[PDB]
């Protein structure tokens, strides 16, 4: 099960540290799970009942924070697991937030804008009881965005009776959102890639990078690592293929091209290569920013990268983890690496609370400052236990939640 | 599954009546399901995490109403199913209530009064979000009583900030409870036994009754059917055996004896008989007030009773239903027959809302008035569809919930 | 101290019954004591700070209930004591109420209607935090009336935001009050006088009564005992003197006369006598409805009445108590006898909650029904302990508050 | 009385300034005084009733702010007095806060961690009515700390229903507290010492300091005055004795030693001296940071210090005041000098409101900025009335509270 | 009608831009209009009923923001219109606020301070339902000030139950107000005058300015344009006349004189001139900061200024607009130019929400920063449509409100 699989990873770090048996049990089970079955009037006039979930795992360190998923395959399990991760993800970044998540079993594609807006409202009204700007602050996830998130904000105000706007994050800038939301995640990855370059003693200008995937994270990660760090993005990949060029790409251009034509492949001035080939390139840093299992048992021994900065979720598998650490390859974990979003999300909530908004430069600095921190905080725990950065991160996280849980 | 099994029974009556396809779907799924994992400090000092559930099925006709279960085998499914029934149960009785239920996976026997009181509080605080005197009014179920219910009421007031006391039912009389709570269910069964006697044209004084089981329901049903109706309880049964006496028993005495000595068996002036034998006695009315399946395929053809007033839950099985109706034997369904409890529970909530308490005679009259009603309301629907009383009851119920669901 | 003096009386009955030591301590100390110092703009333009108290003694059995005192000598102590009594007073009557009281150190006489209204509001606003229709429901006491109580009700609504009217009792009938408020107390005394007559085996028609005092309680007690019971009020008394007439007075007339001319004395057809003389008359029932200590050590042995129904507060002293019981003279205690007011006050609150008002006949029947009850409930406890009715009453009271305190 | 004694000090400055008679009366009496008697289940199982007090003196300028005291000798009086001071203390610092205080008559030493946590909760629940993040924000006092304060915060959330964390101050950093809490008070004293040096024309490097006492305040005052100011701490004292060294101590070391061994005495490289001796040393600045009355009539004439920066409460007595001012010795009053705590407490509340936390440097700067200010604001009023700094501070305070009281 | 006249101006810009027909309709009508008739006890003792209005036009972008008017001629119409403007005014400044306004039909002059305070409270209580720190934040307008505004704040807290202070703006600094309130508007005008000097390519030191009017705005506009910008205020005007002096005035002195003697006229060292004459002076920038219609059809062709910065409301008429733009004379619109007030008001509310107050320099910088912004944002839209700045401003405003309205 998706959940049990997560609890396992937790249990591991739970041992490396002397964590009270019973205390670990409360950190394991989630505080609240709300499942709702609500009707929605479809455009054609017939009513359709939908299943929705909102899970508040842990709240010891603050109000639950986590996105909402619109997928036809979403399951209580999946949600629980994702909520579970949020708890630690936020903890490692050191944010006054807890961990939660939610979703509705629905395929947005077969629903009209009117129907979506409708479902989006009924949902938020159905789970209102459990949420609030000081209890649970939803956010966009798969198949949801600033548009859906704005309907949420609205529906809430209409019920609550006054402007809240701190009830959800990821809202359009003109409606209480924050600047730097888009580049968030990428900038985070960049900050990490640099820091790793440091621990590895590599020179950002002389370094070469390979980014797997070219979505939001991929693009910005490549863009900023290239511009601000000065490294050479020698290869990027699409959902189709990849392109090489030891001379270095011009991410700027590559982006436009990726926009114009469905993919980065076909792009001239680039030696076509496969995705699995990219993962094995001879580069300093490899940023897996696409699908899971990218780095697995099969290629674990082939990776020549000195550092693997996880831009996506679960890019590398447990087995690959072991192999990679054995070979002494630094692997900056996702909970830390691609937490740049959750971080800028905290800023949005903050900016909202005081109805005063910071400009880009600030959001940037703040983001980089906390990334650098988290990185180091994890680093220390790493040496203190001689474990891999991923485990170190879970320990640090499990630590903070426990202490808070204890002090209360 | 326990739930699916109930949905089936519903689907049946759902067909006999022209019920909008999509409307039925909403009546099928439950509105809210809340699952909580809360810690509790055990006497010895260690913390133990427990699982609790509160389910609000339908609320169209009023706030959810249903007890709380303390059992180590309780499961989401079981709760959902039980909640589901409450929806129709209250509906057939015509009470301004919805349907809900809840429970905690715990064995009260291995917990100290201090620990119980503790767990009971933490629970009620954990599900507070979903309940209220106008949202969900819990009540005692298996392994919970006026004592547990009073800790509930207290804990609530301490949080809410003022005396509520309508937050839960089944409280001690001296703390906002209602009179006639004990004899409630039994009196209900009595009222039905009598009414079944009328439509059948039998004379209450000349009639003879056989009550299977001798718990709360059995005793009072036997007691009141004997005293107020004037019928002759010719046989009653224990969890061990049964006793016959065509002359007629003195329920009054039989009760004391049942108290003094663990059972009714051994009781002098009574021809010992088996439980399965009792079911086949030659009496006018047979009140199965014990275990389920009592009347099944095997004995279905043997029952000589003209009327079977179900004092327990599911005494007679589906197959037996068919056979019994085929043979033309009136079978007053449980949802109606043993709903005298839920009914007196409604009055308690009422009395509480206005902090004014009625005396016995009132509670009685009110109870009897509504039973008589429901009975007839069901009777009508029966002729209107030429179905058996049980089905008639589910139709009447499914009808009321739909209308309300429609009007809203 | 006034308070300690009360605690003593309590401690006595607390012993006669096996009451857990620590449980008795909580029943001793009061839950809440709020003291406020608020300014008030006087007519002439200068501000004057006033001291006000609101004390919620016990609340186990319901929301605190008790009047507000406007006196220049009121002290925290006095209030505490009075609140303390309310707790038991309501408990013996069996009302879903707790015990509270309050007051403001001010002499209404030196204040203009405008200033009073002002002070009355500022006060109620200052103690709002502690009160509510379900927390603490003030009422009129010394130097406060339906007028002051109405300003209270208003000020509350203006703050709360909606019509409450269950926030205080003793309001004008046209503004949420109840009928039968005036005759309340007296009717109570009447009911008791009659009941005392029963246990004593005396005939209501043949009986003779002597009422000491002629205020609200005195008049109505005399009026109703005469009209409804048929007894012969042979003597009544003023703050000046008294009048005898073994033939029997016409309370109806006596009332008018008492209105026209400052006193009952001077009234023709009446043999003038002193107050202390009245107490010793040779009558069946003596209703001390005036000042305290009326029946003390000095005259204790002189009283020839078979029953003393306390219409006032503390008419007879402790020593007199002993002597009287020794001599076998039934003494219906005040907490029970003159509780007819608090009782009709409960009804007012009830009628308010459901915004539906009962007519006189109902209020009467309800009042008498509960009086009869309380009387008997006390009677039983009396035999169970072979103590005097006053003690029996405190036990019954202390019992109910303990049980509730325990169940919670 | 402790209270009347404070009112006297107030009355003095009340005269020096033309303060409306009646307006002064409202500033004299406290707005709210809540006294609670609550039970607590002791480990052994028996219940023990405790007495707690919460007093909101004045609120005109903001919500009441003040710590909670756990002592067996605490009395309503003591609390009132302390609350009274908070009102002016915050006023002189110019903080949007009012004045309040509270305490429970209990000896924490005879209670188990479990019992304490229990009592700590029950208390906070009992005084919830009167407090809130915008009404009254408690804080730690004598015998209470971040641990007790965190149980408070928790208990509140559980009742309120959502994360507050601005309900109390002095919480652990990881649970909503603020950085710089420890060094707070000391840094304040430091800032003053410097400002006085300024006014006295002394050079921070050439100056010599003597700190009486070595608790939190003493240590940090000594540490920072030494490191940041560059002065020479020539003597510090314990609850036992003191140590001299005109060469200058190494507070850094002295602290460790004070930790290792119960006292600073015994510490080598230090000429042992008595406490009363320290007070008379020939130094520029003397920081009485220990017990009250330290500087009294007896030694008043002996002090050779040019400036006395009160780090504790009431170190110097009224008589000593007169003498000291007569001799022309600058005496920075406590309300101003040791208010660095209340100040950092305001920041904690601020950081909480916007759920964004500042880092040390900020908390420091903010603290110093306001201290510098308050100092000067007081300085001005001093010249405008040619009174001593203590009186100047009370005037400035009484002024601000009056203006606000007036504008409203 | 005042309202319809405003709707027209809107409709104009509404066309220049492709704005959905129906969307424009919602932007046209105001969301809420509350009219109240409340009594007030007059000093002499008689009650007088008053009429009050509070109008929430649009709220899409935030809570309604707008002052309160005390005038005997105020009408629903006038308010609606004024509210309507606030909506766009805040929108162009880009403040998280909506649009609202209110007023009471009363002449303050005939009311005593006591009566005013009274009325001020009753009013605020009557419109409480519609306002809040997150719904509608009143502010001072004609005939209301920090004093009235403080009675508002108080009355609210007394009802709400806790300190708010974000409920209204324009409060006294010592009571939650902000610094820089007075110079606000003027500074804004200054910022604009400079920016215009820029687009026109004029040198701030060489430029000459003529300010019509000498109230708050006029004086400060003149003061700051002179001191900070270095331009030469060659003429200012009173409600009587004006004074010329090509050498340049000393606004500093001119202010004192205007204070001492009722007007600027009579002031030596100044060539007296008429108001209509001033408007035609040969200066670079003309700041109409007095009455409306100042620049109309009649003088439209006479104005020699290269830039007209509207310090007042509607100084120039529609016809004059056309003529002025035709002649190519830059006209910085009022909604932008004299919005410096609303802007600093936003800051006050912000500072209040986090109970942390900024110092002058901050308030200034923030103000100038946003003014510069709005100016440019408007400038862009101006070129994108080749319309006059006033229209550009309305488009920019109508745009932002629509987008928000759409996203929701």
Q: Locate tokens 């001299």: which residue? A: D244
Q: What are phi and psi of E332, to 5 degrees?
A: -65, 115
Residue A65's CB: how many other CB atoms inside 10 A? 28
Calculate how close chain B gets to A4, using CA atoms only, in Å: 16
Q: Is A25's CB within 8 Å of B49's CB?
A: yes
What's D354's DSSP letter? T
- Chain E residue set in contact with D, beta carbons under 8 Å: 146-147, 150-151, 153-154, 161-164, 172, 174-176, 353-356
Give contacts of D176 with chain A, Cβ < 8 Å: 96
CA torsion angle E83 E88 E91 E97 (round to 10): 10
- Is the Cβ pair E163, D62 closer than 8 Å? yes
Q: Taking CB atoms and an 8 Å limit, are B355 and C132 in contact across chains?
A: no
The residue behind tokens 């903010």 is D366
End-to-end CA distance of chain D: 32
The domains spanning A32-175 and A176-408 adopt the same CATH topology:
yes
**Interface B-C: count of C-beta contacts within 8 A:** 38
DSSP string for A68-122: EEEESS--HHHHHHHHHHHHHHHHHHT-S--EEEEEEE--GGGS-HHHHHHHHHH
Contact B125 D161 (CB under 8 A): no
Q: How many CB pairs under 8 A join A and B?
A: 61
Distance from CA of D268 to the nearest CA of E (A): 48
Query: CB within 8 A of D112, min separation 6: which ones?
Result: D43
3-state helix, strand, coil in chain C (%, to 5): 50, 15, 35
Task: Convert B288-306 into a string of H (helix), E (strand) and C (coil).
Answer: ECCCCCCECHHHHCCCCCC
Count CB pairs under 8 A between chains B and D: 10
Q: Which residues sit opposite E324 in a β-bridge?
A: none
Which is the catalytic residue, given C101, C171, C232, C258? C101
Q: Which two tokens stand for residue C259?
A: 């209105």
Burial class (CB in 10 A: 0-12, 13-18, 19+), B12: middle
Distance separating alpha carbons of residues D375 and D332, to the nearest angstrom: 9
Mutation site for C-interface testing, chosen from E159, E160, E162 by largest number of C Cβ within 10 Å: E159
Which of E115, E125, E158, E162 to probe by mutation at the C interface, max C CB count within 10 Å? E158
Q: Do residues E141 and E92 make contact, with C-beta atoms less than 8 angstroms apart?
A: no
**Given CA atoms B108, B112, B113, B119 in this order, what sign does their dihedral have?**
negative
Could you list the active site residues of A? Answer: 101
Q: Do A150 and E59 touch (CB under 8 A)?
A: no
Whole-number Å distance between alpha carbons of E376 and C194: 93
| Residue C316: DSSP 8-state | B
Map tokens 């209107």 to a residue. Answer: B384
Residues in E closer than 8 angstroms to C125, CB to CB, are 158
Q: Which of E59, E134, E400 sits opposite A174 (nearest CB)?
A: E400
Domain boundaries, chain E: 32-175, 176-408
DSSP annotation of C7 reads H
Q: Does domain C176-408 have CATH number 2.170.150.70?
A: no
| Burial class (CB within 10 angstroms; exposed 0-12, middle 13-18, buried 19+) of B73 | exposed
| Neighbour-count burial for A209-234, b at 16+ CB within 10 Å, e otherwise | bbbbbbbbbbbbbbbbbbeebebbbb
Which chain D residues are Cβ-neighbours of C26 within 8 angstroms? Answer: 37, 39, 47, 49
Interface of D with C (CB under 8 A): 22-23, 25-26, 29-39, 46-49, 51, 126, 129-130
The CATH fold assigned to A32-175 is Rossmann fold (3.40.50)
H or E, element range at A342: helix A340-353
Locate the DSSP E strands across C24-179.
Answer: 32-38, 50-56, 64-65, 68-71, 100-105, 136-137
Q: Select the residue of A147, A151, A354 nearest E354 (Cβ to Cβ).
A: A354
Is residue B393 within 8 Å of residue B336, measured between CB atoms? Answer: yes
Pairwise CB contact (< 8 Å): E135 & A164: no
B162 and C404 within 8 Å at the Cβ level: the answer is no
Place of tokens 């028993």: B249
Give A34 to chain B, closest Cα distance, Å.
5
Q: How far apart are CA A345 and CA A166, in angstroms?
A: 10
CA C342 from centroid of its chain's CA atoms: 7
Q: Record the tokens describing residue D82, joined without a space.
A: 């302390």
- Cβ <8 Å between B49 and A29: yes
Count CB-CB contacts under 10 A for residue D389. Answer: 25
* Ordered DSSP codes for D230-263: --EEEEEE-SS-EEE-TT---HHHHHHHHHHSS-
Residue from B355, B357, B359, B362 whose CB has the most chain C CBs within 10 Å, to mutate: B355
Judge contact between E286 and E308, C-beta under 8 A.
Answer: yes
Contact B67, B144 (CB under 8 A): yes
Angle at B29 between CA B28 and CA B32, to 5 degrees: 140
**Furthest C-alpha separation in chain E:** 65
Resolution of the structure in the document, Å:
2.9
Closest by Cβ to C407, choosing from B163, B172, B353: B172
- Sign of the dihedral through C-alpha C13, C15, C19, C22: positive
Nearest Cα neighbor of A82 from A54, A110, A50 is A54
* Closest chain D CA to residue A129: D161
- Asked if the Cβ–Cβ distance from D158 to B159 is below 8 Å, we say yes
Query: Are the CB atoms for A103 and A52 separated by under 8 Å?
Result: yes
Contact indicator for D93, D61 with CB cutoff of 8 Å? no
Calpha distance D245→D222 (Å, rounded): 14
Which of E91, E129, E408 to probe by mutation at the A interface, max A CB count within 10 Å?
E408
Contact yes or no, A with C (3+ CB pairs under 8 Å): no
Q: How far does the CA of residue E216 sit from the closest CA of chain A (Å)?
A: 28
As a whole number of Å, the end-to-end CA separation of chain C is 31
Beta carbons of E120 and E105 less than 8 angstroms apart: no
Single out the residue of D172, D145, D158, D136 nearest to residue D63, CA to CA. Answer: D136
Distance, in Å, from the CA atom of D218 to the CA atom of D332, rounded to the nearest integer, reads 16
Tell me how close the Cα of C345 comes to any Cα of chain B, in angstroms.
13
Residue with tokens 């110097």: D316
Dist. CA B308–CA B334, nearest whole Å: 10
CB contact under 8 A, C25 and D47: yes
Choose the mutation target among A32, A58, A104 for the interface with B, i.e. most B CBs under 10 Å.
Answer: A32
Whether residues D63 and E147 touch (CB distance < 8 A) is answered with no
**DSSP 3-state assignment of A250?**
coil
Q: Report the gap between the CA of E159 and the closest CA in chain D (Å).
A: 13
SS3 category, B216: helix
List D101, D171, D232, D306, catalytic entry: D101
Instruction: Using alpha carbons, select from D373, D343, D9 the residue that is nearest to residue D181.
Output: D343
Q: How far apart are CA E124 and CA E54, in angstroms?
A: 10
- Which residues on chain C are in Cβ contact (under 8 Å) with E161? 128-129
| Long-range interactions of A169-173: CB distance < 8 A, separation 24+ | A169/A65, A169/A137, A169/A138, A169/A139, A169/A345, A169/A348, A169/A349, A170/A67, A170/A139, A170/A140, A170/A145, A170/A146, A170/A345, A170/A348, A171/A146, A171/A348, A172/A146, A172/A147, A172/E403, A172/E407
Nearest CA in chain E to C44: E43
Cross-chain residue pair E135–A355, CB shorter than 8 Å: no
DSSP state of A187: H
Pairwise CA distance, residues A118 & A152, whole Å: 10
């Amino acid at each position: 099960s998706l959940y049990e699989m997560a609890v396992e990873q937790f249990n591991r770090a739970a041992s490396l540290m002397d964590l009270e048996s019973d205390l670990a049990e409360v950190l394991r089970r989630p505080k609240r799970v709300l499942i709702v079955e609500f009707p929605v009037r479809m455009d054609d006039g017939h009513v359709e009942v939908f299943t929705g979930y909102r899970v508040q795992h842990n709240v010891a360190r603050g109000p639950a924070k986590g996105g909402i998923r619109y997928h036809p395959d979403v399951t209580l399990d999946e949600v629980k697991a994702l909520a579970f991760w949020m708890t630690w993800k936020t903890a490692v970044m050191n944010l006054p937030f807890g961990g939660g998540k939610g979703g509705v079993r629905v395929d947005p594609k077969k629903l009209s804008r009117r129907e979506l807006e409708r479902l989006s409202r009924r949902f938020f009204r159905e789970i209102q009881v459990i949420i609030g700007p000081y209890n649970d602050i939803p956010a966009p996830d798969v198949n949801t965005n600033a548009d859906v998130i704005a309907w949420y904000m609205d529906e809430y105000e209409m019920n609550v009776g006054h402007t809240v706007l701190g009830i959800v994050t990821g809202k359009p800038v003109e409606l209480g959102g924050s600047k730097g939301r888009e580049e968030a995640t990428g900038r985070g990855v960049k900050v990490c890639a640099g820091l790793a370059m440091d621990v590895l003693g590599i020179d950002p200008k002389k370094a070469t990078v390979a980014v797997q995937g070219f979505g939001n994270v991929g693009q910005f990660a490549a863009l900023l690592i290239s511009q601000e760090l000065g490294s050479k993005v020698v290869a990027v990949s699409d959902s189709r293929g990849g392109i090489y060029n030891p001379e270095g790409f011009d991410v700027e251009e590559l982006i436009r091209y990726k926009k114009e034509h469905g993919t980065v492949v076909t792009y001239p001035k680039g030696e076509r290569i496969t995705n699995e080939e990219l993962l094995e390139l001879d580069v300093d840093i490899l940023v897996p920013a696409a699908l899971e299992g990218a780095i697995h048992a099969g290629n674990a021994e082939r990776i020549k990268a000195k550092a693997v900065v996880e831009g996506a979720n679960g890019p590398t598998t447990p087995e690959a983890d072991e192999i990679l650490s054995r070979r002494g390859i630094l692997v900056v974990p996702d909970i830390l690496a691609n937490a740049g979003g959750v971080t800028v999300s905290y800023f949005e909530w903050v900016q909202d609370l005081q109805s005063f908004f910071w400009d880009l430069d600030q959001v940037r600095n703040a983001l980089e400052k906390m990334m650098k921190g988290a990185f180091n905080d994890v680093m220390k725990v790493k040496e203190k236990y001689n474990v891999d950065m991923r485990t170190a991160a879970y320990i640090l996280a499990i630590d903070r939640v426990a202490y808070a849980t204890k002090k209360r």
